[PDB]
Every structure is written in structure tokens, then in C-alpha cells.
């Protein structure tokens, strides 16, 4: 007998997920590739640091 | 050199080489696999190290004694005592493996409480120093000082029959026999509570693959010594083939103990898949 | 008129789906065909952290990229020095069934929790329990620190809660998910945080207003792993369907799907590298895979463990990675 | 640079003390056998053991520590949790044994217990962990079958054609009891590559022999595990 | 998005025959195990039948053993339950349940009160 509340709650949340500005997927792709290209040099996993810089060796 | 003794020396050399190649493999497997760093494999790696020492030191010393050189009495007694120490350490470590298996089978609950790393290391050290003290008994007060380098010339048969065989070979053999008989009985009882005769026969064969091999290896030379001291009566190659059978125990131990386990086979499969 | 609300929710979800399909200009996979892939990546075990009795369940790296916390199912929270391998602290936990652990950014407090439904805070710069946040009706699955005063916790009662450490009360509660929430990940700007539940839904939440901002339903099975992108605009999720999915907070839809027909096991932990080019995910095949976040291809396999990998952690600078599995050993890869 | 070697050696000393503490705790860890306890609300899992030495109530878990023949046992009961149990059950993949208590008196809720046993047995991670079956509340079931008001045929038609096994060691009471036993066993024997088995035991709410039963079952479990480790089973 | 929509139901006379269908969307239906549950007014959930991925293993409870039958089509991502010999007490709302993990056999929370991978169900009334 309480679902009539819960259900309605759900639907409200739905419109609070509706009022949102959605960018294009190509925009997100370009942003992610740019962020990966900028910090690519600062990645020890992507670019293994030499034994002198690596604290583990 | 005599062709018979030459073939004997060559067979001893190839046996030592095969034993080393088989035991350093198990050593490296236990050393590089964290899953194998368990107190039950401590006795197995001790047996592997003992077989390595036998193949690298005991068999070459026995060969040098077989060459029939003329050196210091102590120079040959030291090699004989070292061979005896290494063989007794291998036997003691194999008995420790049997005792660990007995504790794991018949005492499954308290096993994790009984067999731990520290106690296993302590037992290993105790058996090692015990074998060292036993094998060095001729060096202390049981040498046959009456000199050609020969075992009979430096170690009398009395020590090998009374102290070694009747004292350090028969009690451990009987202990292992009772241990594996109880293990077989427990396995049969568990199989009856779970084609069952096929599994019972398989378990019996797997358990006999230790006792029968230990017998076929060690009992020949000891029986030869006994029939040489109690009632001296083809000694040209019977003693040599007895030594060969006794030294084949070190190379057959990895195939029966390590190469048959589950974790060892899993580690082997993993390391051969990583390298392939 | 309950079925009327049912169809209202259905048509709203259809609107959201068609809106997400409208902005779907292309797929990032076909867009990344112009850059050179990462190729083969090989890492070796530098240090092996031994000492845990039972299975390790969670781990977390500190901001200094040196000390790492690890929780073992025998009731032990151990702090390890990644450079020298020597243990710094070993806190005996009151409840042996621990499932999560956290390291504060200041390095002074550590969080713990599990089936006891209580979040315990231990002070390292006093070691005893500072506070015991209680009130959850479910098991603590994940915990993360926002500050030295507030802490976000995830419980199995389909609810998350941001508590105040000194007060000990629920500062904010989130009752949006329908399944048991498994893990959460804090954004680099610490204002938003994503959380994945046992349902096929992963929700973004705000620490200020206390409500669900966005929702993602791209997965098909229980979402157990989650991690945000270093920039704060994207986040990866992993589920038992052997599939990782990268969602965007701005696009509000799935971007890439990492999967392989040979990989049929579940996923436990997901995390990104320093630059986000690599995605390290531990699977139930006793190993971890390093996928390319832009190319979606397995670059490297870390199989030093002997059991299923339970936790995976990357440092703040990406100098090294740590993988903790149920074999009570932690493997450090670099 | 003495301050650096000093702090490093202090860290090494702290690591030595922590290693000593961990080695000391390993003894008490290996000395106790962790056991899982499960069952519905109708089952008497809360009072299944009568030889309990200490019975502690945590925030969400009931702990029961008891010693039998100098062997410790630390059983855990997870009751203060939601209905969804497919996730945290993976936390109990390292226990020595699982005791799933079933109320054999009720027939309508017996199907739920059978489904729960099937799900626990066919688990991917719990495949190496055995499940011990304890059919509690035998007096209620016996009085129910003697009264004849509620028949099992309404819920299980196979009981119409089922008969007591030949190896039964005690008639309708024993018939229904062995029927429930075999119905649980056929689900237990439906899967498993010999790595784990089920140990059915008929116990009452007033029976004090449960501790010895659990002791013997755990001994047999670890013995069969060690036998399978050595290719002896 | 995981969505399970069931059709049919309503009111049916006792002793007759009925068919309940279920359409699945948002995943690979051919990789997950399926189960059927029912909820009676004033009662808990009741599992009645299950079916594996390729239909190699099919099981029913003792209450509906033989009279009910279940099938699945992976080429259409559809589940079917044919109901016969209906009794007045067997009335309940029927729900579908999906395996939480693909190609497994451990279905834990299929009868849970708030399971996520389940439909909203259809009302099924039986009376003379
Ligand atoms: C003839 C002798 C010298 C052979 C040498 C034996 C060596 C190679 C073998 C025998 C016993 C083995 C050790 C026994 C078990 C352990 C404990 C484990 O936590 C680390 C590896 C370690 C320490 C093994 C390393 C390799 C080892 C030392
Ligand atoms: C040439 C002779 C002396 C060979 C001696 C055998 C030595 C090398 C082998 C045999 C048994 C082995 C030990 C057995 C188990 C342990 C306990 C472990 O926690 C540390 C390593 C340690 C202590 C091993 C070290 C190496 C070891 C002592
Ligand atoms: C019949 C002959 C071989 C008796 C042999 C007894 C020896 C091998 C065994 C029996 C019990 C063993 C001890 C059991 C307890 C410990 C505590 C542990 O922290 C160090 C090892 C140590 C000290 C063991 C050393 C070896 C030990 C003394
Ligand atoms: C290898 C040679 C030297 C003999 C091996 C010694 C070891 C394997 C044997 C000899 C004495 C034995 C111990 C004698 C006493 C006990 C008490 C018993 O309640 C538990 C087992 C325990 C602890 C035995 C364990 C195995 C044991 C330590
Ligand atoms: C070195 C040789 C000559 C003697 C070695 C004796 C040892 C290895 C053997 C002989 C008798 C054996 C014991 C006899 C039976 C028991 C009782 C059991 O509940 C625990 C193990 C224990 C205690 C055995 C441990 C190993 C044991 C002590
Ligand atoms: C001391 C001597 C004379 C008496 C003991 C005889 C021994 C060596 C015999 C008796 C039974 C034999 C075993 C019988 C069956 C098998 C299975 C086979 O696939 C491998 C060898 C193995 C395991 C045999 C090896 C040798 C064996 C162990
Ligand atoms: C494990 C099984 C095989 C039993 C172990 C004990 C057996 C092999 C032992 C017990 C007593 C031993 C015998 C004792 C006395 C003699 C007389 C001697 O002139 C030759 C050898 C011989 C005949 C021994 C050889 C082996 C022997 C028969
Ligand atoms: N004799 C004797 C003897 C023995 N009574 N026992 C053992 S070992 C049994 C044990 N330790 O349990 C061994 C050995 N090895 C020998 C031995 C030593 C040197 C040998 O090379 C000389 C060549 C010309 C014959 C030959 C045999």
C-alpha cells in the first residue's frame, strides 16, 4: 500500500535526471584524448621511468 | 680401469646428474612459488637439498673411494663419514615427510596446530644435526684403524650393521610402514563411507610406490653387509648394483613425492605456460 | 492509478534513452583509430608483501604514494611501506570479517568496516579506535575519506552515508540504489562521487545537496568495481558479466566496453593510471588485465597471484600499482 | 646522514615486533576452526550447540567459541543482514564447514530451505567448502506425522512412491525423516567433483550431542581434504 | 538497461490452461539462468520452476511438478510458462528472476523481497 509513494518518488527522480545539459559524445572523446595526451609524459606506467628515477628498481 | 667398475662409476655419475637435475627443479619451484611456501613442503625441500648434496658430494666421494686410491686414513674416513651423513640426512628427512603425512591424515584437526613453520624448521635442524652426529661416529670412535682408501678399510661393517642398519634404518622403515598402513586403512574406511575397489587398489599402489621403492633401494646393500658380517659367504658386481639401487633413491624421490602432488604439478604447469 | 505512474516512469526512461541515443554522434573506439595504441605492456613483481593470515579483502594507497593500507579477513589492518616492505602498523580488528579499508589524505586516520555494520576509525598519529560510526543495517562494502572530519561509507542496505567523524552522526544519507552498493570512488574535485550497487545502476551523488544527480544503467550484472577518471569527467565500472564499461558524467551514457570472449570470470577492482591511458582491472581468473582506455584491447596481464584478486590500487603519481588477492599476498607491479 | 639510517633501523625494529606479534597470532588463528552457520528464522540455529563455552553477540554477528577434545571451534551466525546474501557469503569461502539448520517440521517453508541449500551448494566459491545438514525440531515433525492433520503429499508427491531406505537405522516418522534426508542428499549429490560432501544428522532441540557430531564431521572433512590432496580419495 | 516485461495473466477459470510470456532486454538472455517466483496475498515469494541457459537442466517444485511447464527461446530472448490444472489456492502474482552471474548455477536472491533483476509481475486470479 506504500508503493504508490515509492513509485512516485522514482518518477520524480527521473525528471531530476532529465533537466540536464548533455554534450556530444565526440566532445567527450576529444576531451578524454586531450587529457590522455597532455599527461602522457607524466605517466610512469605508460612511460617506464629509468632505474635512476624509479624508486623500486 | 676395470670395465665393470668403470660402468659402475659412469652409472653413478649419471644417477647423480639426474638426481641434481630433478631436485634443484623442486627446490626452485618451492622457492619461486608463494603457494608452495607451506610447512608441509619444508620436509620436501629438505629432502631435495639432501639429494642434491648426495649427488654433488656423496656420489663423487663414493666414486673416489671406488677408484682404490692410497691416501691418508682420515682423508678417506672423512669422505666415508660425509657420505654416511648425507644418506642419513636424506633418510631422516624422508621419515619426517612420512611423519608429516601421518599427522595430516590421521590428525587432520590438530595438524594446523601441530605442524607449523617454526616447529618444522626445528625438527629439520634436529634431524640434520642428528644425522651429522650419527655419520661422524666412525670419525670419533668407530673407525677401523688397524692405507688404501676403501670403506671397509676406514669404516668397519659392525658400525654399518649394528648402529647404522639396526639403529638408524630399521626403526624408521618400520615407522614408515606402520604410518602408510594406517594411511591406507584410513583411506579405505573413507572410501567405504563415500568401482570403489578400483580406487582402493589405486591408493594401495600409490602408497606402495614409496615403501617398495625404499626397500628395493636400501635393503640390498644392508642385507649384503649383514650376510658379510654374520655369515661371510657374485661379489664382483652385486655390491656395485646394490650401491646403484641405494643411490637411485635420491633420484626417484622427486618423482614419487614432489612430482605427484597437486600444488607442485599446478606450479609446474604455470611456469611452463608462462615460458611457452 | 499506480500503473499510470508505472507508464509515466517508462515513458520518462524512454525519453532519457532516446535523448542519450540522439547525442551519440559516434563511438570513441572508432574515433581513436588515428592514434597509435599502447601496444604490449609488461610489469614485473618488485616487492611481495607477506604476513597476512587470512584472505586480503581491500587496500588503499596513501597520498604520499609510499604507505599502503591492507585489510585481511582474519581481523588485521596492516600498513606497508612500498619502498622498504617493512610493516609500520598492525591494528587487530575487533570483527574479523572486514570487507573494506580506507586511508585518509592526511595520513593520520584509517577506516575499517565489514559484516559488523560499524565503521571504525583508527588514529595512526596518537593505536586505538577513535570513533565507531554505527547505524547501518548492512555490511560495509566501501569507505573513502573526504576530509579529516567527514567520511563517505557504503553499506549493504542499499544506502550510502556521509558521516561526520567528530559528531558520529549521519550528516547525509543516500537512499537511491535498489541493490547492495559494492564500491564508490571519489572525484578529484571531491564534490561529486559515483557509486555502483548490486543492481545494474550506478548513481552519481553530491556531498552538498545530498541527492542523485545522474544515473547509468549500461551494465547488466552486479556492479562490484568502480573508479573515476583522473580528470573527474568519466568513470569506469566493472560487473560479474566479465565486462567493463566507461561512462561519462557529461555525456550521461556509455562510451567504451572492454570485454573478451576468453574472459568469462567476474571483475573485482577497477582503477586508472596517472594519465588515465591504462585501465587495470582484476578478474576472477587469478590475474589482472591492463586494457587501453582509448583502444579497448588487453595490453598486459599480471598473473603473479594464485587466487582471485580482491583489491587493486594505483598511487597518486602512478609510480607503482598494488594488487591484493585472497592468497594473503600483495603483489607490487611497476 | 645518520638520521636516515636511524629511522630505517627503527622501522626495521618495528617490523620485527610486528612480525613477532603476527607469528604469535598465527598460533591462535590456526588453533581455532572457523565455521559458518546458516538457516531460516524457524530453524533453531541460535541454540544448535549446547557445549558452547562462550556465546558473544557482536553488532551484527553472533559468535560461538567452544572446545571439543582440545580442538577449538569458532562458529559465526550472520543474522543482522538483509535478505540479499549472494555477496557477503563469499567472505565465508575459507571456513572449515557450514552448518545449514533446517526445520524439518514445516512443509511449506521446506521448499525455501531446499532452494537455499541448492544455492549454497552450487556456489562457485563455496564448492570447496562442505555443508553440514542438521534437521532440527524432530519432535514437532514426529508429532505432526503422528497427528495426520498435515500430510507431506500436499507439498511433495514423490513421498507417495518413496519408501524408507534399506540402510535405515532408527514407521511413518522414520519414513518422512529419511525422505527429507534423501531429498536433501539428491540435491547435495547433484553437483561437486568429490571436493566436498554433505553430512546429514538428525538432531533435536534438546540434544546435547551436537558438539560431538560437528567435531566428527569436521574431522572427516579435513581428513578427506588431506586424502584428496595426496590423491588418496 | 535490464528490463523484463511480462504479458498475459488476468483472470482464468480453474482447471483450464494459461500461458505467461516474458520479454527481456538490455543484456544477453542466452547466458543467464531463469527462474519463476510467485507472491500470494499475505504470503511470501514462492519459487515454482527454473530453467538453465540452453535448457539442459529444468526443475520444478513439488507443488507444481508436472502440471506446469517452462521453456525459453534465446533467438527471440523470450521465456514461456504454460500453466495447467489450476487450483483456487494457487493464485498469485508471478515474477521472473534472472541469474545474478552469467552461466552459473547458484541463484541466491531470486526469491528476495527487493531483487533488482526481476519484473513487476502480472496478476493471476483463479476462482469459480
Ligand atoms: C645442497 C643444498 C645447499 C641445496 C640448497 C637448498 C636450497 C636451494 C633450497 C632448499 C630449501 C629451500 C628453502 C625452503 C623454503 C623456503 C621458505 C620460503 O619462505 C622462501 C624460500 C625458501 C627459503 C626455500 C629456498 C630454496 C631452498 C633454500
Ligand atoms: C648441505 C646440507 C647442510 C644441506 C642443508 C639443507 C638446507 C639447505 C635446507 C634443508 C631444509 C631447509 C629449511 C626448511 C624450512 C625452513 C623454514 C623457513 O621458514 C625458512 C627456510 C628454512 C629454514 C629452510 C632453509 C634451508 C634448509 C635448511
Ligand atoms: C625421536 C627423536 C627424533 C625426537 C625428535 C624430537 C624433535 C625432532 C622435535 C620434537 C618436538 C620439536 C619442537 C616442537 C616445538 C618447537 C617450538 C618451535 O618454535 C621451535 C622448534 C621446536 C623446539 C621443535 C624442535 C624439534 C622438536 C624438539
Ligand atoms: C626425522 C627424525 C629425526 C624423526 C623426526 C622427528 C619428528 C618428525 C617426530 C619425532 C617426535 C614427534 C613428536 C612427538 C610428540 C608429539 C606429541 C603429539 O601429541 C603430537 C605430535 C608430536 C609433536 C610428534 C610430532 C612428530 C615428531 C616431532
Ligand atoms: C628417528 C627414529 C629412529 C625415531 C622417530 C620416532 C618418530 C618419528 C615416530 C615414532 C612413533 C611416532 C608417534 C606414534 C603415534 C603418535 C600419536 C599421534 O596422535 C601423534 C603422532 C605420534 C606422536 C607419532 C609421531 C611420530 C613418531 C614419534
Ligand atoms: C624390497 C623389495 C624387494 C620389495 C618391495 C617391492 C616394491 C619395490 C614393489 C611392490 C609393488 C610395486 C608397485 C606396484 C604398482 C605400481 C604402479 C606402477 O604404475 C608404478 C610402479 C608401482 C608403484 C610399483 C613399483 C614397485 C613396487 C612398490
Ligand atoms: C618394511 C618391511 C619390508 C619390513 C622391514 C624389516 C625387514 C626388511 C628386516 C627385519 C630384520 C632384517 C634382517 C635381520 C637379519 C638378517 C640376517 C643377515 O644375515 C642378512 C640380512 C637379514 C635377513 C636382515 C635384512 C632385513 C630384515 C629382514
Ligand atoms: N661398504 C660399504 C657401504 C655401506 N655399508 N653403506 C653405504 S650407504 C647405507 C646407509 N648410509 O644407509 C655405502 C655407500 N654409499 C657403502 C659404500 C661406500 C663406498 C663404496 O665405494 C667403494 C667401492 C669399491 C666398492 C661402496 C659402498
Author numbering:
A (entry chain G): 6 to 62
B (entry chain R): 3 to 148, 169 to 216, 224 to 262, 267 to 309
C (entry chain B): 3 to 128, 133 to 340
D (entry chain A): 9 to 178, 184 to 246
E (entry chain N): 1 to 128
Study authors write:
The physiological functions of ADO are mediated by the adenosine receptors (ARs), which are members of class A G protein-coupled receptors (GPCRs). Upon activation by ADO, A2BR couples to both Gs and Gq proteins to transduce downstream signals. Here, we present two cryogenic electron microscopy (cryo-EM) structures of A2BR bound to the endogenous ligand ADO, or to the selective agonist BAY 60-6583, and coupled to a modified Gs protein (designated as Gs in this paper) at 3.2 Å and 2.9 Å, respectively.
Compared with ADO, BAY 60-6583, an A2BR-selective agonist, engages the identical orthosteric binding pocket of A2BR but shows a ligand-specific recognition mode. The pyridine ring of BAY 60-6583 structurally simulates the pyrimidine group in ADO and makes a similar π-stacking interaction with the side chain of F17345.52, while the amine on pyridine of BAY 60-6853 forms a cognate hydrogen bond with N2546.55. Two additional hydrogen bonds between BAY 60-6853 and Y101.35 and H2807.43 are also observed. BAY 60-6583 demonstrates high selectivity for A2BR over A1R and A2AR. Substituting V2506.51 in A2BR by cognate leucine in A1R/A2AR caused a notable decrease of BAY 60-6583 activity. Vice versa, swapping L6.51 in A1R/A2AR with valine remarkably enhanced BAY 60-6583 activity. These results support the hypothesis that V/L6.51 correlates to the BAY 60-6583 selectivity for A2BR over A1R and A2AR, which may be attributed to the potential steric hindrance from the bulkier side chain of leucine. The deeper insertion of BAY 60-6583 resulting in additional hydrophilic interactions with A2BR pocket residues and the valine at position 6.51, may contribute to the high selectivity of BAY 60-6583 for A2BR. At the bottom of the binding site, ADO and BAY 60-6583 contact with the “toggle switch” W6.48 and induce its downward movement and the subsequent swing of F2436.44 and the entire TM6.
